[PDB]
C-alpha cells in the first residue's frame, strides 16, 4: 500500500510488546499492507514475519561467544548494528514507501533504544513515526507508579523527539477491580493530584511536586489500554495514528 | 565504622559506573571503612571486594544454559533474587551498621533497577541513601540531551525515591573545549533555555517547552564531574554525601 505509517513499540523486557506488535499487525492486515521490523539483537523468537531482523546480522548470543559477558554484548551488538546505520535507515524509509503499516520492534532493553546512538539517530531520521510506549500493569501499585509510568513516556519524547503514546499491555489480566482503579488515576486531571498529597514525605511532597503539566500548550495525552489476547484498544490506536499523521 | 552512609550509583552499561565505584571506594578507604555492593548479576568483572555479590545466588550467563535468551535471562536473574529480597536487606542494613560507606552498585541495565521489583522495593527499604546517576559524555552532542539526562535523573529520583544527583563520568576523556561546552548548558540557568530557542520544531518547541522546573520549591541541582582516572569530583561528591544525610 502507501498510508506510509510507521509505529514504533516501545518497552522493557516484559511487557509484551513482541506480542502486542505481532497480533496488532495480524489485525491491520485485514484493511493495510504491513511490513515488521525487529530492531532487537537478544529476543529469542518473532511470532511475525520481520522484513527487516537485526539478528540476520548480529544477536547478542554469538557475541557473548567472543567472551563478552551480556552486559558488554548487549551494547557491543548494537556498537555493530551502527556499521549499517544507513543501510538499515534506507530499508526502513524503503518499507514506509511500499506500505500501509510498518511496525517497529525495539530492544527488549529500552535504555538500549534510549541511549545508544543506533536507535536515536534511527528516530531523527525517520518521517513522523508514532510512539507507543509500553508499560506492564504489574508496575501500577501506588500514586508514585502513575505519574512515573507517564513522566517516562514524556522523556521518550524528548531522546527520540516523536509523539509517544502511554499504554498499558495485557489489559485481559485485570480483574476489573484492577481495571476501574488504573483508569481513575490516569483519566482523571486532579484526582491523581489529589491522591497525591495524603503522602506526608518529602520524596512524597516531592513527587506531589512533579504533578506538573497543566492545561494546553502543554497537554496530556490519552493513554491506551491495550491487549493482544482480546484485541481490546487496537481500533483506538489505529484512530490514533490517522488522527497523529493528519494533524501533525 | 559508622557514618553509616549508603550512595547508590545508577547508570547504563558503557557508563564506566562500576570502576568508579571502585576507585571512589578506594579513595574513601583512607578515612573512612567501606563496603561494596553487586547488584548485578550479568557484570562480568569487579574491580573490587564485594561484600554482598548477587553472582553468588545466580548469573544471567548460567541461566542462559536453561534456554533463555539474554532478555529473558535478565528478568529471570531479578526474579529468582526476589526469593532473596528479605535476606538482601538484612544484609544491606546491617553493612549500613558496620560502615562508614555502603557503596551500591545497581545493574547495568538501569531499567531492571528502575522497573523490577528487586530494586525498586530494596531503596524504598534503605535509610536516606543517595542516588549517583552517571552519564557519558558522548551523549551529549546538542541541548537536546542536557535537559534529557537532567530529566532522567528526576525520574529515577520519583522511582527510588531519593535524592538523585547527576554526574558526567570519565571527564578525563574531554578535550577542554568539550570540558568548556558541557559546563556552560549545565551550571548556568538561562543559557540553557537561551539555545533552547532557535530550534523551529514542534518537537523541539516541544523540548523547549520541558525546560521547566524554575526557582525554589523546585531546586535545581548541582552537576558533578567526576573521574576514576584522575580522581576529579570526588571531594565533591564526598561533600555531596555529608550535606545530604545532615540537612535531609
Redesign the interface.
Not at 539478528?55 to 567472543?66: N, Y
Not at 524509509?93 to 503499516?101: A, F, P, Q, W
Not at 497525591?196 to 500548550?217: F, H, I, N, R, W
Given at each position: 500500500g502507501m498510508a506510509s505509517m510507521i509505529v514504533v513499540f516501545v518497552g522493557?523486557?516484559?511487557s509484551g510488546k513482541t506480542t502486542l506488535t505481532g497480533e496488532f499487525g495480524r489485525y491491520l492486515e485485514d484493511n493495510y499492507k504491513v511490513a515488521y521490523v525487529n530492531l532487537?539483537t537478544?529476543?529469542?523468537e518473532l511470532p511475525y514475519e520481520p522484513s527487516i531482523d537485526v539478528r540476520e546480522f548480529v544477536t547478542?548470543?554469538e557475541i557473548?561467544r567472543e567472551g563478552?559477558?551480556?552486559?558488554?554484548?548487549?551494547?557491543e551488538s548494537y556498537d555493530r548494528l551502527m556499521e549499517k546505520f544507513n543501510e538499515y535507515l534506507n530499508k526502513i524509509l524503503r518499507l514506509e514507501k511500499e506500505n500501509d503499516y510498518v511496525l517497529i520492534d525495539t530492544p527488549?532493553?529500552?535504555?538500549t533504544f534510549l541511549?545508544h546512538e543506533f536507535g536515536v539517530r534511527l528516530m531523527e531520521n525517520l518521517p513522523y513515526p508514532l510512539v507507543v510506549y509500553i508499560s506492564?500493569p504489574e508496575?501500577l501499585k501506588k500514586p508514585?507508579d502513575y505519574?512515573?509510568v507517564r513522566?517516562?513516556a514524556?522523556?521518550i519524547?524528548?531522546?527520540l523527539?516523536?509523539?509517544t503514546i502511554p499504554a498499558l499491555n495485557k489489559v485481559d489480566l485485570l480483574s476489573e477491580e484492577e481495571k476501574e482503579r488504573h483508569r481513575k488515576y490516569f483519566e482523571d486531571i486532579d484526582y491523581l493530584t489529589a491522591r497525591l498529597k495524603l503522602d506526608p514525605?518529602?520524596?512524597?511532597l516531592?513527587?506531589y511536586?512533579?504533578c506538573?503539566m497543566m492545561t494546553e500548550?502543554?497537554p496530556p495525552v490519552r493513554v491506551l489500554y491495550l491487549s493482544a489476547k482480546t484485541r481490546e484498544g487496537f481500533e483506538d490506536l489505529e484512530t490514533l495514528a490517522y488522527e497523529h499523521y493528519c494533524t501533525?
Amino acid at each position: 500500500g502507501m498510508a506510509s505509517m510507521i509505529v514504533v513499540f516501545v518497552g522493557t523486557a516484559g511487557s509484551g510488546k513482541t506480542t502486542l506488535t505481532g497480533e496488532f499487525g495480524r489485525y491491520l492486515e485485514d484493511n493495510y499492507k504491513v511490513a515488521y521490523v525487529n530492531l532487537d539483537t537478544g529476543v529469542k523468537e518473532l511470532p511475525y514475519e520481520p522484513s527487516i531482523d537485526v539478528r540476520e546480522f548480529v544477536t547478542v548470543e554469538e557475541i557473548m561467544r567472543e567472551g563478552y559477558g551480556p552486559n558488554g554484548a548487549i551494547v557491543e551488538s548494537y556498537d555493530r548494528l551502527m556499521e549499517k546505520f544507513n543501510e538499515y535507515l534506507n530499508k526502513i524509509l524503503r518499507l514506509e514507501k511500499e506500505n500501509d503499516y510498518v511496525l517497529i520492534d525495539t530492544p527488549g532493553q529500552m535504555e538500549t533504544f534510549l541511549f545508544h546512538e543506533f536507535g536515536v539517530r534511527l528516530m531523527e531520521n525517520l518521517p513522523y513515526p508514532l510512539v507507543v510506549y509500553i508499560s506492564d500493569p504489574e508496575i501500577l501499585k501506588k500514586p508514585n507508579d502513575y505519574c512515573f509510568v507517564r513522566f517516562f513516556a514524556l522523556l521518550i519524547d524528548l531522546r527520540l523527539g516523536a509523539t509517544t503514546i502511554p499504554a498499558l499491555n495485557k489489559v485481559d489480566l485485570l480483574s476489573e477491580e484492577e481495571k476501574e482503579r488504573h483508569r481513575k488515576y490516569f483519566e482523571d486531571i486532579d484526582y491523581l493530584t489529589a491522591r497525591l498529597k495524603l503522602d506526608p514525605s518529602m520524596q512524597g511532597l516531592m513527587a506531589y511536586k512533579m504533578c506538573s503539566m497543566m492545561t494546553e500548550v502543554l497537554p496530556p495525552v490519552r493513554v491506551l489500554y491495550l491487549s493482544a489476547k482480546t484485541r481490546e484498544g487496537f481500533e483506538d490506536l489505529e484512530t490514533l495514528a490517522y488522527e497523529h499523521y493528519c494533524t501533525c
